[PDB]
Amino acid sequence: SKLGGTPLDIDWYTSWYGLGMKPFEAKVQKDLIEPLDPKDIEIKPDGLIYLPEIKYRRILNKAFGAGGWGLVPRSQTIVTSKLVTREYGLICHGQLISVARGEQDYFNEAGIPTATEGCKSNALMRCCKDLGVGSELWDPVFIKKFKVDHCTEKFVEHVTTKRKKKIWLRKDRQVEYPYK
Amino acid sequence: SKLGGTPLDIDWYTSWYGLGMKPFEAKVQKDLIEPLDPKDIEIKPDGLIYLPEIKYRRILNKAFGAGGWGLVPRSQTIVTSKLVTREYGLICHGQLISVARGEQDYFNEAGIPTATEGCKSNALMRCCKDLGVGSELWDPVFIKKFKVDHCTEKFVEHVTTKRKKKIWLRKDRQVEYPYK
Amino acid sequence: SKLGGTPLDIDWYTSWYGLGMKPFEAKVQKDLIEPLDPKDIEIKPDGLIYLPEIKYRRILNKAFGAGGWGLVPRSQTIVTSKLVTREYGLICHGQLISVARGEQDYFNEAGIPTATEGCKSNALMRCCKDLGVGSELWDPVFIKKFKVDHCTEKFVEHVTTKRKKKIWLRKDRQVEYPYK
Amino acid sequence: SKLGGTPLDIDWYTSWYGLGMKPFEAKVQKDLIEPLDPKDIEIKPDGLIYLPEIKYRRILNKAFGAGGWGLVPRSQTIVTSKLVTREYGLICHGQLISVARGEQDYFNEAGIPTATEGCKSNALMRCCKDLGVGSELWDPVFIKKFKVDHCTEKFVEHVTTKRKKKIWLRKDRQVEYPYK
Amino acid sequence: SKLGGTPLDIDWYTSWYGLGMKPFEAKVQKDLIEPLDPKDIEIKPDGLIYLPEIKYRRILNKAFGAGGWGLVPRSQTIVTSKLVTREYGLICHGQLISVARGEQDYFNEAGIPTATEGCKSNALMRCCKDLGVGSELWDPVFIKKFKVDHCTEKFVEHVTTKRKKKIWLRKDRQVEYPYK
Amino acid sequence: SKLGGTPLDIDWYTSWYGLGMKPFEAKVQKDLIEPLDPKDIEIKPDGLIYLPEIKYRRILNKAFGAGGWGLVPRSQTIVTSKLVTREYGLICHGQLISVARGEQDYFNEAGIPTATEGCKSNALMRCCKDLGVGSELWDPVFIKKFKVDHCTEKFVEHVTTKRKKKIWLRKDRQVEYPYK
């Protein structure tokens, strides 16, 4: 309502089966809590570190295997005038793990069908928090220590607005669009 | 009503199964009441100490394991003009533990879908109180002793309002946005 | 009605199962009636002694264990113009112990979702009275003796109203906000 | 009606199971009729002796144990313009003992939720009369003898009305608010 | 109707089970008909002797034991403009003994909830007549003989009306409020 | 709605059977995560690398075999004024893997039936992300490294607009329509 949008064996659309039922066995637990490789962490120009969704998918495929996990829609797609949002549930080994809401910003009317995939990835990322995957990305100590040895805040020039902005970038990457 | 908002095997949405049924066995009990590491406690500029939600998630994954616990929605999301609130229930080993209401302040209409995740974390934090996780954060003696040996109240200058505020910060951290 | 507010295996919302059915076995009984440590008792500036709710939670987790007890809502949340109130029932080992009404004063419209947690704690405190937890806090002899050897009534100055009030404080603590 | 108020395994809300069914065994009987310690009896300034409700709770926990007794609501809370009243039933060992009406005077609209706990205690006190707990408080000989060796009627001065009232106080206690 | 008032295993509210079914065994019979101790009998200023209700409760607890007897409401509370009345039934050992109507005079609108307890005691006293408890209080010979050796009719002075009334008092007691 | 379009053994149209049920056995897992051959990766003139859908089909036929996988429609075809979109579900070995939405841009009214096949391929590509097929195409490090050793950004001339655009092309391919 407050979102100014209109809708775009086990009934997994509504079922809560297995949620918090029994923990996974040892090797899955070790695979899920494996420390993140520092080379896999990206940072946005405003200074926010994150992990690409494809790394989350790779971790899930390493821990549960292909066909051992999936994303199930839990609500209808809501298309706000500037974003597309939907709820998704993570199922691992026939077990409901989490239900999280994802969103993706779209900028063109024709980009709405593309935005619904970003939303899905966002939901997947937010579901993996219940598994402890990539938890260091939310650790303030980890963020603070990562940004002093692996990142740099450079005053670069925007290629379009012709203005200069101090942006954050990794020490291995280079200045990029929409800047120089 | 008084909240000026509009709605946004076991039916865990309404079920009360296992609530206060039987205590967890010994090693889970020891894992839950493990003392908090002082380096993991953060403090806000106004002087309120807390633990990041990711530490609560890590503790829950250490005590019950991945897939051994989960959060289940218990009510509909209510979107007040300045906050998003919802009730969540903590399920550990097929057992309802607590039902707590979380809230998250949002400042933009497009930030509502993001706020619903903060709410979830807030609810999770408030559910862990029934487990005794992080109980020292509510102990007045603990708060009083923590703020004299591990924290500092520095008169810093706000980077935007150009005014000076005595804010609280850890002795290991440094002055930060929205201040100097 | 007289409250000028509007609503905000076992069906524990309405069930009375186990209420006064059979007493707990010996070690739980000893754990519940353990004398309170004098260092854990706080006193308010007006001179009223109390125990923090986190100590009640710790006692319950020590007597029944995590997962061995819980709070179940018994009524709908009523939001009076200045307070939030709700009834809660304490369940210990699958047994209804007490149903008590809690309340929490809120001062901002955005503080209502936060107030619903204070209410819950209040209800928990009032439920523990049926267990005899912290009973010395209601003993007039205990209150009278505690306030002469462990407390002090100091004429301090309010930091905002710039007036002087004789307030009660422990001999170990110090003057605090909203005073000097 | 005449009260000018508006409403605020076994269905114990209405059940009469066990009422006067079989007496408790010997040690419970001895625990219930144990003579009251004279140091535990309080007296009000107008000259009425009583026992604090926490002593009744302690006696019940000593005779039946924690979880061996409880209070069950029997009617709806009626909120008269100056008092809150409700009926409660005492259940001991799965047995209905008594149904008694309690009341508590409130003086502020925000004090109604607090008053509902006083009412509960009052009902508990009045239920214990069927068990013979504290029966000496209703014995005229006991009251007459207690007030001559353990109490004193002193002409003290009210701290607010600045008038002098002959009030009753124990010989061990001292003059107190709302007097000197 | 003629009362100008408005309403305020076994369904004991209406059941007649056990009424006059089988007599109690010998020791209960001896306990019930034990002669009253003369020191326990009180007399009112107008000259009417009686036994305090707490003595009736003590006798019932001595004969049937705690939990071996109880009072069950039999009608709705009727609140006349100057009295509160209700019917109660005495149950002893799962057996209906008597149904008697009690009444209690109240003098303030806030005293109605307190009056409902006096009514209950009155009903209990009137139910014990079927058991023969305290029967000497209705024996005209007993009353006549008790008032000549244990009582005194003294012309005392009312502390409020400042008039003199010949009142009846025990030889052990003293003049009391509302007189000198 | 927000899309301005009109509709154009196991009920696989709606069923969720097998979603995240059990992982595929070892050789299928190895076949799915086989590294992509660099010669099979294409790049668009704007600089976006991708894999042709026929390579995804070949990988699926290599991992599951012909008849071992299929695409099932999940929604109705929606024909926006400039695109055709539809949801498809990937079924592998009688197991639902993913449900993804595909879209295809059409430029003529007679090209709508042709566009519905592009949509299907798009959906298939987006379903294979749950299997980890071609995951390197979403790895920012992989994209960055691929574009410096295998690609070239050449300033070529558009054959129609007669303007010059710096476009991206592989080092093995040549300039092509709609350019020179």
CSV table of C-alpha atoms in Angstrom, one decimal, chain A residues 4 6-13 39 42 52-55 57-58 61 64-73 79-81 86 91-94 106 109-110 112-114 116-117 120 172-174, chain F residues 1-4 14-24 29 32-33 80 82-83 85 87 95 97-103 105 122 126 129-132 134-142 144:
chain,number,residue,atom,x,y,z
A,4,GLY,CA,3.0,3.1,-4.6
A,6,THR,CA,0.7,-2.3,-8.7
A,7,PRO,CA,1.2,-6.0,-9.1
A,8,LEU,CA,3.2,-6.8,-12.2
A,9,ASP,CA,4.9,-32.4,-3.2
A,10,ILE,CA,5.2,-29.2,-1.3
A,11,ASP,CA,3.4,-25.9,-2.2
A,12,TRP,CA,6.6,-23.9,-1.8
A,13,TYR,CA,4.8,-20.6,-2.6
A,39,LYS,CA,40.1,-10.4,-3.9
A,42,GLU,CA,34.1,-5.1,-4.5
A,52,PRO,CA,28.8,-9.9,-6.3
A,53,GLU,CA,25.7,-12.1,-6.4
A,54,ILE,CA,27.5,-14.6,-8.6
A,55,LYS,CA,29.9,-15.3,-5.7
A,57,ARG,CA,25.6,-18.4,-6.2
A,58,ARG,CA,29.0,-20.1,-6.4
A,61,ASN,CA,26.5,-24.4,-5.4
A,64,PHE,CA,24.5,-27.6,-1.5
A,65,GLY,CA,25.3,-28.5,-5.1
A,66,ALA,CA,23.3,-27.8,-8.2
A,67,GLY,CA,19.7,-28.8,-7.7
A,68,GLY,CA,20.3,-28.8,-3.9
A,69,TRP,CA,19.0,-25.3,-3.5
A,70,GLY,CA,16.6,-22.9,-5.2
A,71,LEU,CA,14.7,-19.6,-4.9
A,72,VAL,CA,10.9,-19.7,-4.8
A,73,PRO,CA,8.7,-16.6,-5.1
A,79,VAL,CA,6.4,-2.3,-9.5
A,80,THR,CA,6.9,1.1,-7.8
A,81,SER,CA,7.5,4.0,-10.2
A,86,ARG,CA,9.4,-9.0,-4.6
A,91,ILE,CA,15.1,-23.7,-0.1
A,92,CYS,CA,18.1,-25.9,0.6
A,93,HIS,CA,17.8,-29.7,0.6
A,94,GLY,CA,14.0,-29.6,0.7
A,106,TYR,CA,14.8,0.5,-12.9
A,109,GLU,CA,9.7,1.3,-18.7
A,110,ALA,CA,11.3,-1.3,-20.9
A,112,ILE,CA,11.2,-3.5,-15.8
A,113,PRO,CA,11.6,-7.2,-17.0
A,114,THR,CA,15.3,-6.8,-16.6
A,116,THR,CA,13.0,-8.4,-11.9
A,117,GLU,CA,16.2,-10.4,-12.2
A,120,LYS,CA,15.9,-11.9,-7.5
A,172,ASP,CA,43.8,-3.1,-8.1
A,173,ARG,CA,41.0,-1.6,-10.2
A,174,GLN,CA,41.1,1.7,-12.1
F,1,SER,CA,0.0,-3.9,-14.8
F,2,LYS,CA,2.9,-1.5,-14.8
F,3,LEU,CA,3.9,-3.4,-17.9
F,4,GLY,CA,1.7,-1.7,-20.5
F,14,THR,CA,2.2,-24.4,-11.6
F,15,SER,CA,4.0,-27.2,-9.7
F,16,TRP,CA,7.0,-26.5,-7.5
F,17,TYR,CA,8.0,-30.2,-7.3
F,18,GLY,CA,11.7,-30.9,-6.6
F,19,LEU,CA,12.8,-27.3,-6.2
F,20,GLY,CA,16.0,-27.4,-4.2
F,21,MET,CA,15.1,-31.0,-3.3
F,22,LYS,CA,18.3,-33.0,-3.9
F,23,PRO,CA,21.6,-32.2,-5.7
F,24,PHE,CA,22.5,-33.8,-8.9
F,29,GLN,CA,27.9,-31.2,-11.1
F,32,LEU,CA,27.7,-27.8,-15.1
F,33,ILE,CA,30.7,-25.9,-13.5
F,80,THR,CA,4.4,-4.6,-24.2
F,82,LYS,CA,8.2,-2.6,-27.5
F,83,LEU,CA,8.9,-6.0,-25.9
F,85,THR,CA,8.1,-11.0,-21.9
F,87,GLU,CA,8.2,-16.5,-17.3
F,95,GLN,CA,13.1,-31.5,-10.9
F,97,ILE,CA,15.4,-25.8,-10.9
F,98,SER,CA,14.5,-22.1,-11.4
F,99,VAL,CA,11.7,-19.9,-12.6
F,100,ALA,CA,13.0,-16.8,-14.5
F,101,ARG,CA,11.4,-14.1,-16.6
F,102,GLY,CA,12.7,-13.5,-20.1
F,103,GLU,CA,12.1,-10.7,-22.5
F,105,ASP,CA,12.6,-6.6,-27.9
F,122,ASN,CA,16.5,-15.3,-22.5
F,126,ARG,CA,18.6,-16.7,-16.8
F,129,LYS,CA,22.3,-19.0,-13.4
F,130,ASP,CA,20.9,-21.2,-10.6
F,131,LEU,CA,23.0,-24.1,-12.0
F,132,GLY,CA,26.2,-22.0,-12.1
F,134,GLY,CA,28.7,-19.6,-17.3
F,135,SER,CA,29.1,-17.9,-13.9
F,136,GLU,CA,32.3,-16.2,-15.1
F,137,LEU,CA,30.2,-13.9,-17.3
F,138,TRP,CA,29.0,-12.2,-14.1
F,139,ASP,CA,32.4,-12.1,-12.4
F,140,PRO,CA,33.7,-8.5,-12.5
F,141,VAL,CA,37.3,-9.7,-12.4
F,142,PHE,CA,36.6,-12.1,-15.3
F,144,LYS,CA,37.8,-6.9,-16.6
